[PDB]
Amino acid sequence: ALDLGSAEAKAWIGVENPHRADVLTELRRSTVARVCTGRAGPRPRTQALLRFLADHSRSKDTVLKEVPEEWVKAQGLLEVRSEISDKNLYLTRPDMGRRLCAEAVEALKAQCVANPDVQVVISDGLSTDAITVNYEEILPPLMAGLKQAGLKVGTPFFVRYGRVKIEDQIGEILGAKVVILLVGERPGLGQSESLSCYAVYSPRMATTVEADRTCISNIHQGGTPPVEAAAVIVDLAKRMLEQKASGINMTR
Amino acid sequence: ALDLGSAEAKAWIGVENPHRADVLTELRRSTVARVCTGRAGPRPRTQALLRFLADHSRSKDTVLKEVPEEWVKAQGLLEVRSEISDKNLYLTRPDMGRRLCAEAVEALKAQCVANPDVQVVISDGLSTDAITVNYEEILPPLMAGLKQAGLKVGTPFFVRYGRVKIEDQIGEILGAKVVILLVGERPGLGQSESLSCYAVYSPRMATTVEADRTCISNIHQGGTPPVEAAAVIVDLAKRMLEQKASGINMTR
Amino acid sequence: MKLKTTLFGNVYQFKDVKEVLAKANELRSGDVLAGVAAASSQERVAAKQVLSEMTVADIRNNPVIAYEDDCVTRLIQDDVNETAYNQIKNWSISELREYVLSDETSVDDIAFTRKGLTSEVVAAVAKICSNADLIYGAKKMPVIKKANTTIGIPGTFSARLQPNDTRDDVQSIAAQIYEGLSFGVGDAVIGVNPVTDDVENLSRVLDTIYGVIDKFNIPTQGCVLAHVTTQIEAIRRGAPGGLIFQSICGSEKGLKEFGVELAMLDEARAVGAEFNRIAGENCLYFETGQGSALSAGANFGADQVTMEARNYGLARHYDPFIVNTVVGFIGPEYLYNDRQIIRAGLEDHFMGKLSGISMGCDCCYTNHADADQNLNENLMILLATAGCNYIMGMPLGDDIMLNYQTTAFHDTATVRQLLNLRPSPEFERWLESMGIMANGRLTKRAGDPSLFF
Amino acid sequence: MKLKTTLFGNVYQFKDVKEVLAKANELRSGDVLAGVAAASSQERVAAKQVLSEMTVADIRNNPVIAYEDDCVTRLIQDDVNETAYNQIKNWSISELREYVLSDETSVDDIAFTRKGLTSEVVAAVAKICSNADLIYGAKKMPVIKKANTTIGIPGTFSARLQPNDTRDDVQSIAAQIYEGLSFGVGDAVIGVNPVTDDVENLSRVLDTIYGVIDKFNIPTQGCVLAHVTTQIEAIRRGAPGGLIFQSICGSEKGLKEFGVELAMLDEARAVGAEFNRIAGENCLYFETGQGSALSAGANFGADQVTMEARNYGLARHYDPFIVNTVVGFIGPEYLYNDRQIIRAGLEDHFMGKLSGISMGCDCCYTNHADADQNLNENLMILLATAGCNYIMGMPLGDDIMLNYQTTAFHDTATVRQLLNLRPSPEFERWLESMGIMANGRLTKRAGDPSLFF
Ligand code: B12
Ligand code: B12
């Protein structure tokens, strides 16, 4: 008997007559990728196909699912929308996710601090798990590190249904010199808590291209740990204000 | 300078360097199958593909076309209904389309005649165009034919969203000795006006199989003409009542 | 056996083998309509794992309609080689999948092993196979039969000439025949569905087909696809017998719906041996398809994939020259879309080949289903790579009379020249002598029915 | 020219060539999102007919972004052989389609003819092709290039090894490489997408790839798929150069979004010539895909198929070793489901082969699109019959880091053994010497990375 979501199922070696079986364990240890599962002819083995299919059913569910509106409230965040109403419309209309709705603009002017040096924005994006799991490890050392021997920090807020070009509008309205977006990148098959940072110096909707952004991706416990990633993003924000550039316009 | 729906596009011969081009014309004339269009390598010629795709666009529209209910009123027909509400539900539930809804049973027991020798039912089924184009040519000489030199004729009515196994419930409710159903089959590519007749001697929902039915199919102007096909069905209904049998149970 | 498993901490319990067989299916429209489909993707995978852990003996000893109550079940059970079965009875379906797919398993290995299968076990293997599993699995299980042509040899690819007409008009039938032959279609059979089911119409349509066959000395066979009783009568009364056809279903109730008894098919074999113009030892032709048992009320709570496998166990008893599924012939109620019609096509062909029948496919759709001609061309090519024995051929694939779209004459010539496949060797030789084919390829003069005049 | 046809008695009027090109497309979610799609099937077919009546001149003289405004348009227009163009300029697109598909049109015929084409004309042919048209047409248009392997010879099939990791951990990269080679993947390239665009990190990844290459004397290429500027920097400072990669887009504004100037790609050619460990004359690697220009706001009212053709016209100028589209890499906003992803994959490959580049495909999908692994397996086999130059390989197709699903290592071995295709002849030689392959087939001891130890 086997749970396909178990650690034993993940550790399985399916190569049937190994050349060197002690090497096979060390190779399976080194990797999260589905190495060492063997074959039937040129086809996947049955257990490997079954665990693939199980992980896909679970990965499909991480797409649809949404953060509680009260989780954001109990985190002490402003919640604000894009132009998108719901999760079904989010997936088909990227253009609407790159724009704040009319009430979101007015809330940002009402309730957020004007002309910050560094603005931190959190969005669910395409993975709710990415921002739900990682938050308490990334965000408090991010807000401390920008303050502690640093400068004028913005008040952090949540955008529901955000895609990354929305941070150009956020930088324009708030007058922000640096805009940091932490956002859920699209879910992988066995893993859905991967976070990315997108950061841009002094953005403008008319002129800013994607290459002007710096990306820090794969933030999670299987990637770069969210604790030590916060120190990377603080260092990046410091450098961005120093040389007055982001992305491909940065040195070294 | 070509309409793809035109007679010229229908008659087009596309064979490049023909052995005998006068034979090709007669072969094209002999059939409404899409012969003699030639090839490019092993693939269809462009115009033959275009005329295919044009006809398919027209064909898809015919499947979800419906009668006006006021057309059904103007034919002098009772409209009665299956369990299905919409055309989208008809296409996905066969099982609801072969038994009547709860107000349809009470309509048939109040308004239609009891224990006929012959009982004629019309349904749109899968093609509305099949019973709209053909009706004036089918129904008058059929309903005259069963009375004029015959015996006891039933009162004809319309079933919306009907599939052919609904005529077993119609035969049990009305006590009918022969139950004829004229119904739209699947629309083809080039043509959507093909009518079928399905007919049982003395049907019963528990007992009767599909082989107990006689089928006569492809009733339109390009098959068997609806006037002379009406003479075929009356002769078939006479032969049903004589030997007390239909379908595979019939002689010769 | 286990009828339960744990997936992601959740216990998934199933009532019987029949429910496990049903719910392990890839999603299709007819399984939902039968009320037998999985409720979620997780339960589908759980059903797949329970099925894979179930043994060959588990599924053999639980057929979906009982032995006492069903002549098709009896026929399938009684045809089992018990020595082949006893070798494999304690294999899991997982192990049987991996056995079929293995490059160390030869055609002769499967030749004996498949004799210990029943149809339900054949279905169970297909349910835990991916699309590429179904294609590669079928490809390494060739089935070869012989009428006046040999079909199913690896490296070959055949086609039914289907010259149907609204009136059974013999000029329109002949026109479509001359067209098909000019593309190299007709090595499987020249096969007409008639509009009228009577002897003198059957004989006249058979005279038209064999008029062309005899004039040009074509190595092939003719068929008129009426009810088997009418064919037998026509051939007895002296019409040319080629192949003898019957549509079949995977239960006794389904056969009774079709108006067929098993003794009719026994009579068909005996009438073939007395009368028919066939050089080889195979002369029967069956058509099948997912949904037919469901339509008849004759699936008995089983899914349409298991029911369709039982068609192949039935067909195998009679050792036919050809069988094809008719994959999207009925409509969207049973298979809704491109991906459902592809998946069913690959399932049906794999299951046929595993049952040891000469399996082809009518790659087709209807106009009230969510599909187009690009689907037909997708599916025909995938199935050709799986070593599908034959497809249909009609002028651009438009059936003017059965009101659906199948594959073009063009499409067989396309597949052959794309994949370097040949016709039936007897028929290829005829095509080369007519100047229609050289080295597997259509000549300049090909594609032109005027060549015969 | 005519912007106008009558279909079933109704006039269908279009504004410009751009609108005709857009609406002639098969339905996809990207064209609807762009606002450029046909309103119905009737208007789609009307757009197809209007397009097919237009000449090569009509569409060449109307590029979707103007000559003076766009450096990619200038590159495409200035690369035209005008003598080849003047031969074919008065051909209709109908006639050009039938010319491509013709068995009397040889590889040498298309070799001159394609030099008279622009990308918009290449797109125009693809729009009036069926799925089987796209597959057959692409197959009779082989494109052969050479690095340390030769790719694109008919009868062969190559694969990129894609050994990606969340941390660029050199043991996890190596483990995936040893897995991939044991299935015979990597004759196209061993190509890592890195987490950090960084010279120290790039060199360490490249040292790991070429550690395995130099140890076992493998005839293949290494690549690290960072931005082209950081690749060039790392190779200049003395990291092993194999293939040099850039993602490209079909407009100047699209290139600006990616941070790419044309002179970077010139520099990549010159750096490759000075530094790279490549025996043959091709050393560049591009990736493309439908939706990218639309995402960048850089499609300028044009559909994503026409934009993707312009990628290939850009790519052709630099005569790269390999190009692949990344067909379902982005998600459902541009291509929603199985049917759309298949159609786009067949379109992109046909257009690449027609433009005369070494065209492969990442047969792939995302977890927020309506798609599964059976689609990857459907598409990889269809494209392999089309003579697709290469696909990707990952362990069961699971990217742990780019968060999508491509084809397995299994899948390349399946395709090869299904269709009797070989690797690159140099890489096949190496596989045979390693005991991994005999006669095209994986040996018993293949599929096992412990063989290398
Ligand atoms: C999907 C994807 C793309 C898509 C873009 C998606 C779209 N247009 O809708 C395409 C195929 C276009 C693409 C292209 C490139 N990408 Co990319 N991409 C990804 C991927 C897999 C998903 C990112 C995601 O989920 N975003 C979250 C969603 C919610 O945001 P979104 O608004 O819907 O999408 C935006 C961003 O994804 C952004 N984006 C995508 N890639 C990149 C790369 C950089 C450097 C930047 C600044 C932005 C950016 O473009 C979209 C704007 O509409 C990640 C890998 C990962 N695990 O995250 C890599 C990844 C972010 N990309 C990468 C790279 C290098 C590239 C290229 C520069 C490749 C090259 N060498 O030329 C190009 C150019 C990007 C550009 N300047 O526009 C690297 C970034 C490395 C880094 N630390 O800076 C990553 C991390 C993958 C890797 N190789 O490690 N990519
Ligand atoms: C789809 C179809 C089937 C499907 C039925 C499933 C279904 N849901 O319809 C399948 C694949 C099972 C099938 C099988 C056969 N069919 Co059929 N079928 C068709 C088709 C293409 C559609 C008819 C239609 O659209 N009906 C209208 C819709 C609205 O009704 P429905 O409730 O959805 O469908 C019912 C009827 O179609 C009925 N039915 C289907 N076929 C037949 C055949 C006969 C003789 C009878 C009495 C009833 C019948 O079964 C369904 C009840 O659930 C027609 C071709 C045409 N020209 O129309 C042939 C057609 C009706 N069938 C034909 C034949 C001969 C057969 C077979 C007997 C083949 C054989 N020779 O063994 C078998 C057995 C059928 C049986 N006796 O039960 C002939 C009938 C000839 C005649 N006048 O007697 C036709 C006309 C085609 C032809 N060859 O010319 N078929």
PDB file of C-alpha atoms in Angstrom, chain B residues 40-128:
ATOM      1  CA  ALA B  40      -2.008  19.191 -54.534  1.00  0.00           C
ATOM      2  CA  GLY B  41       0.410  16.385 -53.846  1.00  0.00           C
ATOM      3  CA  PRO B  42      -1.673  14.071 -51.639  1.00  0.00           C
ATOM      4  CA  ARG B  43      -3.617  17.028 -50.190  1.00  0.00           C
ATOM      5  CA  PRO B  44      -6.914  18.694 -51.234  1.00  0.00           C
ATOM      6  CA  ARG B  45      -6.833  21.665 -53.584  1.00  0.00           C
ATOM      7  CA  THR B  46      -7.325  25.043 -51.908  1.00  0.00           C
ATOM      8  CA  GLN B  47     -10.813  25.778 -53.336  1.00  0.00           C
ATOM      9  CA  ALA B  48     -12.051  22.283 -52.389  1.00  0.00           C
ATOM     10  CA  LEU B  49     -10.811  22.882 -48.822  1.00  0.00           C
ATOM     11  CA  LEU B  50     -12.401  26.385 -48.752  1.00  0.00           C
ATOM     12  CA  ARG B  51     -15.765  25.026 -49.990  1.00  0.00           C
ATOM     13  CA  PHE B  52     -15.510  22.257 -47.353  1.00  0.00           C
ATOM     14  CA  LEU B  53     -14.913  24.767 -44.533  1.00  0.00           C
ATOM     15  CA  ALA B  54     -17.667  27.103 -45.823  1.00  0.00           C
ATOM     16  CA  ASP B  55     -20.190  24.265 -45.810  1.00  0.00           C
ATOM     17  CA  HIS B  56     -19.117  23.233 -42.287  1.00  0.00           C
ATOM     18  CA  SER B  57     -19.732  26.761 -40.945  1.00  0.00           C
ATOM     19  CA  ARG B  58     -23.277  26.599 -42.384  1.00  0.00           C
ATOM     20  CA  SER B  59     -23.753  23.042 -41.062  1.00  0.00           C
ATOM     21  CA  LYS B  60     -22.939  23.932 -37.422  1.00  0.00           C
ATOM     22  CA  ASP B  61     -25.647  26.645 -37.467  1.00  0.00           C
ATOM     23  CA  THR B  62     -28.364  24.150 -38.502  1.00  0.00           C
ATOM     24  CA  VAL B  63     -27.932  21.861 -35.451  1.00  0.00           C
ATOM     25  CA  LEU B  64     -28.989  24.549 -32.922  1.00  0.00           C
ATOM     26  CA  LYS B  65     -31.589  26.197 -35.166  1.00  0.00           C
ATOM     27  CA  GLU B  66     -35.101  25.799 -33.737  1.00  0.00           C
ATOM     28  CA  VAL B  67     -38.718  26.141 -34.904  1.00  0.00           C
ATOM     29  CA  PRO B  68     -40.775  29.124 -33.921  1.00  0.00           C
ATOM     30  CA  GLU B  69     -43.534  27.747 -31.674  1.00  0.00           C
ATOM     31  CA  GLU B  70     -45.925  30.015 -33.609  1.00  0.00           C
ATOM     32  CA  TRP B  71     -44.958  28.129 -36.790  1.00  0.00           C
ATOM     33  CA  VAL B  72     -46.056  24.957 -34.959  1.00  0.00           C
ATOM     34  CA  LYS B  73     -49.323  26.711 -33.966  1.00  0.00           C
ATOM     35  CA  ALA B  74     -49.851  27.806 -37.611  1.00  0.00           C
ATOM     36  CA  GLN B  75     -49.528  24.206 -38.863  1.00  0.00           C
ATOM     37  CA  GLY B  76     -52.454  23.318 -36.567  1.00  0.00           C
ATOM     38  CA  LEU B  77     -50.216  21.134 -34.385  1.00  0.00           C
ATOM     39  CA  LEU B  78     -50.266  20.629 -30.659  1.00  0.00           C
ATOM     40  CA  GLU B  79     -46.841  21.478 -29.276  1.00  0.00           C
ATOM     41  CA  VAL B  80     -45.795  19.092 -26.523  1.00  0.00           C
ATOM     42  CA  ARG B  81     -42.447  18.899 -24.715  1.00  0.00           C
ATOM     43  CA  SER B  82     -39.804  16.432 -23.483  1.00  0.00           C
ATOM     44  CA  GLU B  83     -37.980  16.634 -20.110  1.00  0.00           C
ATOM     45  CA  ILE B  84     -35.302  18.777 -21.803  1.00  0.00           C
ATOM     46  CA  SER B  85     -35.521  22.605 -21.478  1.00  0.00           C
ATOM     47  CA  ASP B  86     -32.746  23.949 -23.817  1.00  0.00           C
ATOM     48  CA  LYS B  87     -31.007  22.861 -27.056  1.00  0.00           C
ATOM     49  CA  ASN B  88     -27.714  22.622 -25.115  1.00  0.00           C
ATOM     50  CA  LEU B  89     -29.306  20.115 -22.715  1.00  0.00           C
ATOM     51  CA  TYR B  90     -30.789  18.107 -25.622  1.00  0.00           C
ATOM     52  CA  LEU B  91     -27.354  17.555 -27.159  1.00  0.00           C
ATOM     53  CA  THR B  92     -25.944  16.168 -23.893  1.00  0.00           C
ATOM     54  CA  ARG B  93     -28.915  14.163 -22.470  1.00  0.00           C
ATOM     55  CA  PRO B  94     -30.419  11.414 -24.729  1.00  0.00           C
ATOM     56  CA  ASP B  95     -32.154   9.904 -21.684  1.00  0.00           C
ATOM     57  CA  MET B  96     -34.335  12.950 -20.985  1.00  0.00           C
ATOM     58  CA  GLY B  97     -35.294  13.276 -24.669  1.00  0.00           C
ATOM     59  CA  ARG B  98     -36.878   9.826 -24.844  1.00  0.00           C
ATOM     60  CA  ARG B  99     -39.323  10.327 -22.001  1.00  0.00           C
ATOM     61  CA  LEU B 100     -41.932  13.072 -21.654  1.00  0.00           C
ATOM     62  CA  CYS B 101     -42.222  15.678 -18.889  1.00  0.00           C
ATOM     63  CA  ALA B 102     -45.030  15.544 -16.320  1.00  0.00           C
ATOM     64  CA  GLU B 103     -47.361  18.049 -18.038  1.00  0.00           C
ATOM     65  CA  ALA B 104     -46.853  16.366 -21.435  1.00  0.00           C
ATOM     66  CA  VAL B 105     -48.498  13.112 -20.244  1.00  0.00           C
ATOM     67  CA  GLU B 106     -51.610  14.992 -19.033  1.00  0.00           C
ATOM     68  CA  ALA B 107     -51.794  16.984 -22.299  1.00  0.00           C
ATOM     69  CA  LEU B 108     -51.832  13.791 -24.402  1.00  0.00           C
ATOM     70  CA  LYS B 109     -54.512  12.080 -22.280  1.00  0.00           C
ATOM     71  CA  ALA B 110     -56.881  15.079 -22.531  1.00  0.00           C
ATOM     72  CA  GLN B 111     -56.505  16.414 -26.075  1.00  0.00           C
ATOM     73  CA  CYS B 112     -55.537  13.505 -28.357  1.00  0.00           C
ATOM     74  CA  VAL B 113     -57.708  10.541 -29.413  1.00  0.00           C
ATOM     75  CA  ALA B 114     -57.627   7.193 -27.575  1.00  0.00           C
ATOM     76  CA  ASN B 115     -56.553   3.868 -29.204  1.00  0.00           C
ATOM     77  CA  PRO B 116     -55.822   4.838 -32.853  1.00  0.00           C
ATOM     78  CA  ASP B 117     -54.860   2.311 -35.535  1.00  0.00           C
ATOM     79  CA  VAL B 118     -52.211   4.777 -36.746  1.00  0.00           C
ATOM     80  CA  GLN B 119     -50.621   7.631 -34.772  1.00  0.00           C
ATOM     81  CA  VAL B 120     -48.360  10.227 -36.389  1.00  0.00           C
ATOM     82  CA  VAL B 121     -45.753  12.146 -34.352  1.00  0.00           C
ATOM     83  CA  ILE B 122     -43.490  14.973 -35.594  1.00  0.00           C
ATOM     84  CA  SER B 123     -40.244  15.966 -33.857  1.00  0.00           C
ATOM     85  CA  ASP B 124     -37.446  18.393 -34.737  1.00  0.00           C
ATOM     86  CA  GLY B 125     -34.867  16.048 -33.151  1.00  0.00           C
ATOM     87  CA  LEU B 126     -31.372  16.863 -34.401  1.00  0.00           C
ATOM     88  CA  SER B 127     -32.392  19.010 -37.398  1.00  0.00           C
ATOM     89  CA  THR B 128     -35.191  21.604 -37.456  1.00  0.00           C
TER      90      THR B 128
END
